[PDB]
Design a protein around this ligand. Structure first.
Ligand code: TRD
Ligand code: TRD
Ligand code: K
Ligand code: K
Ligand code: K
Lengths: 243, 251
């Protein structure tokens, strides 16, 4: 119904204005602080190093930023067979971190075609594992239904399936990332959330051991496939309940 | 069937190795060039400015990089205004997650986790709602083509017609606008639109991000509204093709 589509649109637009005001309140005091710190650090450099002009300073900062935008660290390979395989998977999963991004005009042209004829291909694999996990969930709810309202059985089992994935694909990998990457308890859970939601800001990237990067993508594939199966299972029920 | 899941997995793993080798061939010569450029530029700075030590140089570069990671441009003398913060909220919700604007505060990250978990499925409803309305537009248009040959051939000619319709209204027309407003190349404009609608969002190109550009107030929310209708249309097209394939799988 169109009366409900407008109602959801009102909720979403309210959620963005509300959410936007919460983020502003949480990040603008930090942004204001960092704006003052870089201005004071740049002024301190020119104050101590008299031989440097303010324009020659900006030229170097711009050169350091241009190198960073290309993917080269201006401190002290990102396209090796392993890293380029992980970047390909970063496009396919729609995560798109941004730490590694095509800089060549030709590299962009291929990235456009690789996403268009690649993201639906991943849909098939995610749907396949989705159909397989459905068989596991369906048999488990039928086992509880053989013992135990149908809605109460469905809600209890689903929450357990959700929490099962929250330990195996959310908690356990965040613990591994806290030890390997050396991030904080927050940053590890934050990265896992930002990765599995396919948001992928790129502010935290795993592998930034040889078996690490391919095993990280395999975790993404199973991790996504599991929650995608639960979301499919809940959706299918809602449309059945709608009829 | 599990026999087909393994078959798709083989194709996907082949597609990543193949694709990865193509990207390496296209980007490693450029990466090798930029690696030499920054090394020569840093050495030239210390050569001309004798009074600067190599360690004091790295300290400044790291300070400039730390400011950039926070979202503050280390060039010359806000990203969280009611306008930009609304667009960032939408960037989380749509799962695009560009990167230019990202939570740096511990508390901001905690809220970002909760805002995505209890927000991305809410967007699902909105995209499903518009997708349920577009299906009515598609079903009537397929019936109009069928009024003018097998049903599958009609569906193929109708699907091509629907994709081409969206490729002009949500892909070509907005890329043309972005080429004039942002000032990007003909490639970068189409590339940004593709990277945006695919919900990939690298953040290498972000609409309403140039400091030296004096944008209008209606720009950023209308750009997000384009994302909504744009995504909704291609999501409805994808839901339609999938539905038919599962129907064909049974029959
Ligand atoms: C073929 C595209 C794959 C990426 C989309 C998966 C979305 C997962 C959303 C999880 C929901 C968590 C609240
Ligand atoms: C609940 C938000 C879902 C966002 C992901 C949708 C992906 C759409 C891809 C369309 C196909 C383009 C080739
Ligand atoms: K992204
Ligand atoms: K995404
Ligand atoms: K993304």
């Amino acid at each position: 119904k169109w009366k409900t589509v407008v109602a959801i649109f009102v909720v979403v637009v309210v959620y963005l204005v509300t959410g936007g005001l919460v983020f502003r309140a949480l990040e603008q005091p930090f942004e204001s602080s960092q704006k003052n710190t870089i201005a004071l650090e740049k002024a301190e450099f020119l104050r101590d190093h008299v031989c440097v002009s303010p324009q020659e300073l900006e030229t170097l900062i711009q050169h350091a930023l241009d190198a960073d935008n290309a993917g080269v660290s201006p401190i002290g390979s990102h396209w090796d067979l392993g890293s380029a395989f992980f970047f390909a998977g970063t496009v396919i999963t729609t995560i798109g971190y941004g730490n590694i991004a095509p800089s060549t005009e030709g590299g962009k042209i291929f990235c456009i075609l690789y996403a268009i004829f690649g993201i639906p291909l991943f849909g098939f694999l995610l749907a396949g594992i989705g159909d397989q996990l459905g068989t596991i969930f369906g048999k488990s709810i039928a086992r509880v239904e053989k013992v135990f309202s149908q809605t109460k059985i469905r809600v209890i089992s689903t929450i357990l399936f959700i929490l099962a994935g929250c330990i195996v694909f959310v908690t356990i990998p965040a613990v591994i990332f806290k030890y390997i990457e050396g991030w904080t308890a927050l940053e590890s859970i934050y990265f896992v959330v930002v990765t599995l939601t396919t948001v992928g800001f790129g502010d935290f990237v795993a592998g930034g051991r040889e078996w690490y990067k391919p095993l990280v993508w395999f975790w993404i594939l199973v991790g996504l496939a599991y929650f995608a199966a639960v979301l499919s299972m809940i959706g299918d029920w809602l449309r059945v309940l709608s009829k």
